[PDB]
């Protein structure tokens, strides 16, 4: 259950080496408006692939 | 007369933590581990002044043996022939000559072989 002695700050950083959050590669541009959005998502202004979907 | 021991203790700890500079982890940061580290470093430095004097002699002896075996003779017969030829050249100088100027070493092996054989 408990440790026999405490780990180092080195073994702590090596453990946290795999915790880096991936960035989004690039946001895509809509054809009509030009606003950035995620792929396969609608924009904030409700456009998807050049079509006004939500009011 | 109440004596407060902050300044003297901080100086005595900074003295030790200056000597543990370059050690891994808490040995260069934490006072207790740095004190044990500095004390064992002093013990090792004493022991290794002695072992330095040993290790350089065995290095010179290996080089003299190699450069003598390139001249036919072993180390043992070379040192025996140089003792019977009455020279005072020690092993530091013989090793330096054996690497740097091989002509003098051939002359020395010639003298030692003339005395030995």
């Amino acid at each position: 259950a408990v440790q026999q002695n405490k780990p180092t700050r080195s073994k702590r950083g090596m453990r946290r080496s795999h915790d880096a959050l991936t960035a989004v590669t690039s946001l895509s541009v809509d054809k009509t408006s030009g606003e950035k959005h995620l792929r396969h998502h609608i924009t904030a202004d409700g456009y998807y692939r050049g079509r006004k979907v939500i009011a | 007369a109440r004596v407060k021991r902050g300044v003297i203790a901080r100086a005595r700890h900074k003295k030790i933590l200056k000597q543990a500079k370059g050690y891994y982890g808490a040995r260069s940061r934490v006072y207790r581990v740095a004190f044990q580290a500095v004390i064992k470093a002093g013990q090792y430095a004493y022991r290794d002044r002695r072992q330095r004097k040993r290790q350089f002699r065995q290095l010179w002896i290996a080089r003299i043996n190699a450069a003598a075996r390139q001249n036919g003779i072993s180390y043992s017969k070379f040192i025996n022939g140089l003792k019977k030829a009455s020279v005072e050249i020690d092993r530091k100088i013989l090793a330096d000559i054996a690497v740097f100027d091989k002509v003098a070493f051939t002359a020395l092996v010639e003298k030692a072989k003339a005395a030995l054989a």
Partner: protein, 142 residues
């Protein structure tokens, strides 16, 4: 003054080819390890690899005196349940001839990264031919 030390960039290494036919195992292996470490050169340095490259041809024809051809057992352990494998000198010579020479030399070398590098200097073949003709291997007889 300070004593001379070798430097790993300026050390100039030679190539040798040794025909191991009809020779004793451990005598040849001792000469090989001595040449591999570099103890025959005057500019010997205990932490710098000073030795030379050796191509040992004909590891099939190595000899062992006494009844060691049938009774020198090589033990190695696979790191498992209880499997201790063993092979005598005959089936080791037949199955994998170069392993005899490499085991005999690797037992005689220092252990550590420098010893592994000076073992990488050694190149053992079982045939009479080698593909190292572009480095001019001189005959080192022993």
């Amino acid at each position: 003054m300070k004593t001379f030390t070798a430097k790993p960039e300026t050390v100039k290494r030679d190539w040798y080819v040794v025909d191991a036919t009809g020779k004793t195992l451990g005598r040849l292996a001792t000469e090989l390890a001595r040449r591999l470490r570099g103890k025959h050169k005057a500019e010997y340095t205990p932490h710098v690899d000073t030795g030379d490259y050796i191509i040992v041809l004909n590891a099939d024809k190595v000899a062992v005196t006494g009844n060691k051809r049938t009774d020198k057992v090589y033990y190695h352990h696979t790191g498992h349940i209880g499997g201790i494998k063993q092979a005598t000198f005959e089936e080791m010579i037949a199955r994998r001839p170069e392993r005899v020479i490499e085991i005999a030399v690797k037992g005689m070398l220092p252990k550590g990264p420098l010893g592994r590098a000076m073992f990488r200097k050694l190149k053992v073949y079982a045939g009479n031919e080698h593909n190292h003709a572009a480095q001019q291997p001189q005959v080192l007889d022993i």
